[PDB]
Amino acid sequence: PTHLSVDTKFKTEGLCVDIPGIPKDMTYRRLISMMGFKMNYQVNGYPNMFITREEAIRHVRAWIGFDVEGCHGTNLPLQLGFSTGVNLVAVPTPLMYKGLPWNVVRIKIVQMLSDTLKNLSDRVVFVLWAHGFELTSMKYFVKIGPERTCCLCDRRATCFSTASDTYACWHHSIGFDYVYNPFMIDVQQWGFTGNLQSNHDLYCQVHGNAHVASCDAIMTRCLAVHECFVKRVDWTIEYPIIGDELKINAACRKVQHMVVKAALLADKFPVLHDIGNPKAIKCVPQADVEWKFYDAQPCSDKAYKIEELFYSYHSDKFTDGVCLFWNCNVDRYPANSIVCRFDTRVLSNLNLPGCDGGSLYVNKHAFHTPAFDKSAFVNLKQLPFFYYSDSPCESHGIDYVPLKSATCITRCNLGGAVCRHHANEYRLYLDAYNMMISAGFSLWVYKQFDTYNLWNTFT
């Protein structure tokens, strides 16, 4: 039970308006054959074009919703829609393109998937709400065979060229015309009552239906992401490193210790209510403060209602001391809070678009995060950048230029001039901070927070 068997049954009901008379009894084997593909009994790493739901989830970075609308059938033109927003009209002779024959349409398909996926995945997974034309049109831009490697590198082959009879990964596909060994999954195989728009609209208001194929491709993938990452949560599934994952997470841990440590020095809160991940550790283990923990798993549907986290009768007096919501998404934060809230709008290779305004943040694990809402922070202010250090001014051990900054809160800066050690740490902390901000995180703090109260901790 690692791969999807070709002898598995395929429910064909959703395919009988474009394919009238299609048999009720159908396996993937007969379906791939009907699509115009010969599998030849190949034990070379590609057992089925279609994949399991578990395999689709392990490869979410590769998802591209795909839908074809019969615009007028190898007589009528076909509008090919993709969840990237692209609409290509192929003739059999929001980005809507005019009718062009398959030989040029296929070149555009390879460019679009290559530029979209080269930094995300080693493959493409076509997410469908299959009715007929998308499966039958796959023979016009897809070639299948044994698993292969790139002609220019050691990555897996995702594209083929008829002009040169060579294979390439997403990075080296310039000029390639065919999609090689793609994967696909039909959402309509998961047991849905009603059409695509009806099932999608139950959970999302962001994606409308402007009746173009790309609208259905977007709603398809959005619904597939809700089923796999909103209503079903699997935090065990590990995901390959494709970017700045380790630096972003190290930066987040440094910023948390910094922001919280300074807050406890500046306003000397007797108690700290730490609301969030049930596996949390005290980020400032030397602080005098009464550290109280409360468990709240990363919500993936709607942000927590502050009235349910705190009320119905815990320390109970959350109003006493300070509240820390580190990556804990609530609808309206209290005034006495330190908050790290991820911005689902951020454009990055880690953050994939999600359902109902949310985003799927993929960094080691997959976390669907609810839509950003500036109203959550009405009782708070944006946390300003600062670097605080009580460590001794001692070098031990990178050519220097004197650091001069009003945001370097150290004994040396108070006393007149920043020492080398603290200037190395400042520039390092500023990089880790900038790294965290770029990854999409936001930092918010109680309105009375003032970095001025930190200079007095050097009496």
Ligand SMILES: Cc1n/c(=N/[C@@H]2CCC[C@H]2CO)s[nH]1
């Ligand atoms: C218009 C739009 N942009 C999107 N970008 C996705 C990011 C991962 C590849 C793309 C797969 O759809 S989704 N909707």
Ligand SMILES: [Zn+2]
């Ligand atoms: Zn390559």
Ligand SMILES: [Zn+2]
């Ligand atoms: Zn949606």
Ligand SMILES: [Zn+2]
């Ligand atoms: Zn110093």
